[PDB]
Amino acid sequence: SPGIWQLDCTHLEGKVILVAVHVASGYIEAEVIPAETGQETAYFLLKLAGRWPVKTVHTDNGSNFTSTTVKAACWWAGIKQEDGIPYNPQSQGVIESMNKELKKIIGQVRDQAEHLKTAVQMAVFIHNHKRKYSAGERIVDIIATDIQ
Amino acid sequence: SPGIWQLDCTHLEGKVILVAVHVASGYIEAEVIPAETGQETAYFLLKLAGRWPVKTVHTDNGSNFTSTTVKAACWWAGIKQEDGIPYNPQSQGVIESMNKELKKIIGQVRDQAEHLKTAVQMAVFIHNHKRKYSAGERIVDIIATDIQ
Numbered sequence: 001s002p003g004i005w006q007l008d009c010t011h012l013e014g015k016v017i018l019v020a021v022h023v024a025s026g027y028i029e030a031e032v033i034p035a036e037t038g039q040e041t042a043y044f045l046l047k048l049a050g051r052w053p054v055k056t057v058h059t060d061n062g063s064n065f066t067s068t069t070v071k072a073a074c075w076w077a078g079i080k081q082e083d084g085i086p087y088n089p090q091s092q093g094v095i096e097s098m099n100k101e102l103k104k105i106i107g108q109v110r111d112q113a114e115h116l117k118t119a120v121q122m123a124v125f126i127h128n129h130k131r132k133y134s135a136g137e138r139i140v141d142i143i144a145t146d147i148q
Numbered sequence: 149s150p151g152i153w154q155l156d157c158t159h160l161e162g163k164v165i166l167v168a169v170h171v172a173s174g175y176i177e178a179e180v181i182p183a184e185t186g187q188e189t190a191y192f193l194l195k196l197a198g199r200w201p202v203k204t205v206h207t208d209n210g211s212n213f214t215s216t217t218v219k220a221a222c223w224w225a226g227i228k229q230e231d232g233i234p235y236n237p238q239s240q241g242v243i244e245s246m247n248k249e250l251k252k253i254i255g256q257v258r259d260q261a262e263h264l265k266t267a268v269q270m271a272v273f274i275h276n277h278k279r280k281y282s283a284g285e286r287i288v289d290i291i292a293t294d295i296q
């Protein structure tokens with residue numbers, strides 16, 4: 001459970017926002033990319049796994065699940081790649097709500113930033129600090145408890 | 149303190165590697181950029197502060213300390229910007245050693261990656277997972293203890 005992440009891809013301003021959600025906490029990392037390729041997804045996962053103890057990733061679609069570049073990155077970083085099929089059917093809706101929430105925050109800050117990527121990182125900041133404990137506090141506690 | 153980070157800028161292959169070190173743990177995040185500008189530094193700090201509770205940043209040089217863009221980002225993200233003057237000189241040597249260590253790891257992986265940025269993220273991974281507890285474990289424990 002402390003090592004489980006979910007990939008999520010959403011669209012805005014003709015660009016792609018790639019999101020990784022730490023399932024147990026709601027903590028996110030996100031990046032803007034031109035389009036979702038295996039290459040971009042692989043690089044994003046490498047970055048993520050160097051920063052947090054990523055054990056399992058539920059991939060966002062079959063193309064990234066199949067991608068040999070994504071598979072190579074998961075092998076390199078010690079990540080178990082799984083499908084992201086919501087067998088638990090509250091998963092679809094929960095991701096959906098987050099995408100809407102994220103886009104809402106992006107809209108609230110969009111004017112403060114010249115570039116979309118900046119607005120997205122502002123949204124990541126606001127999302128992870130929002131007291132609901134915050135997601136940032138929850139992920140740290142979950143992983144610390146797991147280490148001890 | 150759990151919230152103290154140090155900026156560090158090093159060069160490789162005609163490019164710039166921007167590093168943020170969590171001082172108490174040795175945990176790092178890093179990115180490759182064309183050159184160290186206020187703009188790049190500001191964006192990097194925004195990303196960092198959305199991911200970890202950054203209270204204080206010791207800037208790597210006077211240009212980033214002075215930069216109005218860096219100051220704007222620090223204001224936005226609630227970061228206290230300080231100088232990075234090694235009033236204790238066992239600080240300057242510790243950064244030196246890390247840059248050398250990082251470049252060594254980069255050399256050990258460079259061949260596995262087409263692009264420098266990939267090799268840098270591999271080096272971040274290896275550095276943060278290396279048991280000596282790992283840096284990744286230490287940062288999580290320090291911040292968890294601080295929350296609770």
Ligand SMILES: O=C(O)c1c(C[C@H]2c3ccccc3C[C@H]2O)ccc2c1OCO2
Pocket residue numbers: 038039040042043046069072073074076077260261262263264266267
């Ligand atoms: O080759 C690259 O640098 C490169 C790769 C592949 C590499 C890679 C990436 C992650 C982990 C191991 C390895 C090994 C290796 O397969 C993928 C995506 C990228 C890349 O550059 C930017 O986006």
Ligand SMILES: O=C(O)c1c(C[C@H]2c3ccccc3C[C@H]2O)ccc2c1OCO2
Pocket residue numbers: 112113114115116118119186187188190191194217220221222224225
């Ligand atoms: O405007 C941008 O998007 C932009 C900025 C400035 C913005 C910014 C950046 C961080 C925090 C607050 C604010 C407010 C605002 O000043 C800086 C660097 C960048 C940017 O784009 C990529 O690198």
Ligand SMILES: [Cl-]
Pocket residue numbers: 128129136137197198199200201
């Ligand atoms: Cl946070």
Ligand SMILES: [Cl-]
Pocket residue numbers: 049050051052053276277284285
């Ligand atoms: Cl780690």
